[PDB]
């Protein structure tokens, strides 16, 4: 069986086991702000930031057919300060190519250039979306399970704890085919699930990359905070 | 869309919505108690308990081919307080024929005769598995979803939290047939998932009786308490 996993219980400048794009800062105090904070202490709008996991991860192979199972997990806070203009534009963990580069900002969260499904994106996100586009659900924040499109297969709507702490699993069984994203409030208990019918192989390149990425909106304080505490993920493709 | 739901943030004695069964009593603090709690405090082995909703579910209709979707909330607590000799039995949630009675204890949970793989049951399930049967995984605790037999279809591991509140959350879509079940401490900020297809119009009948049961074992203190402090329910037929 061939594995990886990785475990940051918090964020450690200049470590070259993650890459930073874009806006991502790491903190002193060991916090990932995906995107920016002003000197204020207030999210700036015309934002984007990601990062990525340096090793690649093996998920399929084309000639023994064999898919990988895997699981993340990551803590996460979003702050919006703001009551006009609404918030934008939310955070998304993402799996796809690997030597990618931040995408599209704003609503496509850095990961998509714009909103058309298309099979050439090779890429799987679990979304945490702030902002309804036009091709989003009416509610937000919600859930979304991205398939090669911003446009989700599925979202689930939640209500943000605003600037508490969300505890985020996200777990892919290569038996069943199925993706599960779970959202858990400490703060208030409140626990949100999401789960569809995803095959990898169909999905993803035999290697891909694993990454967090988050925007804000595009017009004047049309922001909020995405900062991440923790992450850690693990697969495993058997042999 | 025909809609039935429910929800007790707390039980209270004499509610004529749910039906007790076996040694299942309501105390005067609100707590359901699936098993029997000794005067000296210490649960009670052979001990089998169950609760109904007194309402039966439309869960999918023969003439239309529509299946509903469904979800259920509840928590709970179990403590192990004997050294010796290993706890048992556990707690299950469960679907199945109406107007049904206890079945035999111990490792069936009150909820099945045998460890036969048995359509006739009509019965799906996700346990809370405390003692580890000839048919179970080595591990104990482990979640499982049952369908149609104790032998589960898929079991996930967890650590108990001795005598510390769950909350579990249970939902299945009817369009991907995914049923998962996840399980939070917020004692300790634990996590648990678990899902495997299921499609319900093979298995439960029509009309169902929703239900949570619990069972001490077969052994003088095989026993652990099965405490439940709140339960919810929601299910949309379409049409
Ligand atoms: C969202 O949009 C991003 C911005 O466009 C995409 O990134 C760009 O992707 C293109 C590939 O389509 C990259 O361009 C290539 O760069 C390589 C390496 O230098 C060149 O070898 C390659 O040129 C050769 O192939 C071309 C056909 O693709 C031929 O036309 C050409 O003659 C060569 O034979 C190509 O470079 C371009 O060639 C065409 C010229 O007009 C152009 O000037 C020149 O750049 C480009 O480098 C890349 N930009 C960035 C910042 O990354 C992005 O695409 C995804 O990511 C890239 C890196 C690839 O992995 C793609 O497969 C992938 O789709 C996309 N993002 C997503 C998620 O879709
Ligand atoms: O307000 C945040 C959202 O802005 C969206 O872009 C809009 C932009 O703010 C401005 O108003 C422009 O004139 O219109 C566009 C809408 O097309 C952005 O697409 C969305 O994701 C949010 O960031
Ligand atoms: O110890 C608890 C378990 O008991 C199991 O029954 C056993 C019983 O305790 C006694 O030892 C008897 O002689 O053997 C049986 C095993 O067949 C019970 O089946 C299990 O669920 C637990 O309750
Ligand atoms: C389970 O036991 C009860 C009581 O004997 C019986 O009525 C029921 O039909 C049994 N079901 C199965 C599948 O054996
Ligand atoms: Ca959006
Ligand atoms: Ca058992
Ligand atoms: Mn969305
Ligand atoms: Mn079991
Ligand atoms: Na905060």
Do not use: C
């Amino acid at each position: 069986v061939e594995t990886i996993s990785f475990s940051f219980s918090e964020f450690e400048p200049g470590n070259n086991d993650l890459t930073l794009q874009g806006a991502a800062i790491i903190t002193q105090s060991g916090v990932l702000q995906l995107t920016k904070i002003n000197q204020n202490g207030m999210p700036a709008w015309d934002s984007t930031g990601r990062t990525l996991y340096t090793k690649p991860v093996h998920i399929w192979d084309m000639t023994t057919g064999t898919v990988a199972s895997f699981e993340t997990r990551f803590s996460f806070s979003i702050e919006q300060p703001y009551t006009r203009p609404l918030p934008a534009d939310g955070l998304v963990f993402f799996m796809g190519p690997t030597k990618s580069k931040p995408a599209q900002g704003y609503g496509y969260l850095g990961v998509f250039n714009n909103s058309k499904q298309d099979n050439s994106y090779q890429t799987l996100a679990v979304e945490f979306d702030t902002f309804s586009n036009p091709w989003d659900p009416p509610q937000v924040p919600h859930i979304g399970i991205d398939v090669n499109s911003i446009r989700s297969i599925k979202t689930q709507p939640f209500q943000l704890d605003n600037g508490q702490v969300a505890n985020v699993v996200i777990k892919y069984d290569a038996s069943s085919k199925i993706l599960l994203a779970v959202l858990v409030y400490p703060s208030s208990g409140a626990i949100y699930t999401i789960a569809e019918i995803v095959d990898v192989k169909q999905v993803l390149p035999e290697w891909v990359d694993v990454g967090l990425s988050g925007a804000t909106g595009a017009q004047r304080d049309a922001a909020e905070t995405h900062d991440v505490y923790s992450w850690s993920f693990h697969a495993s493709l058997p042999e």
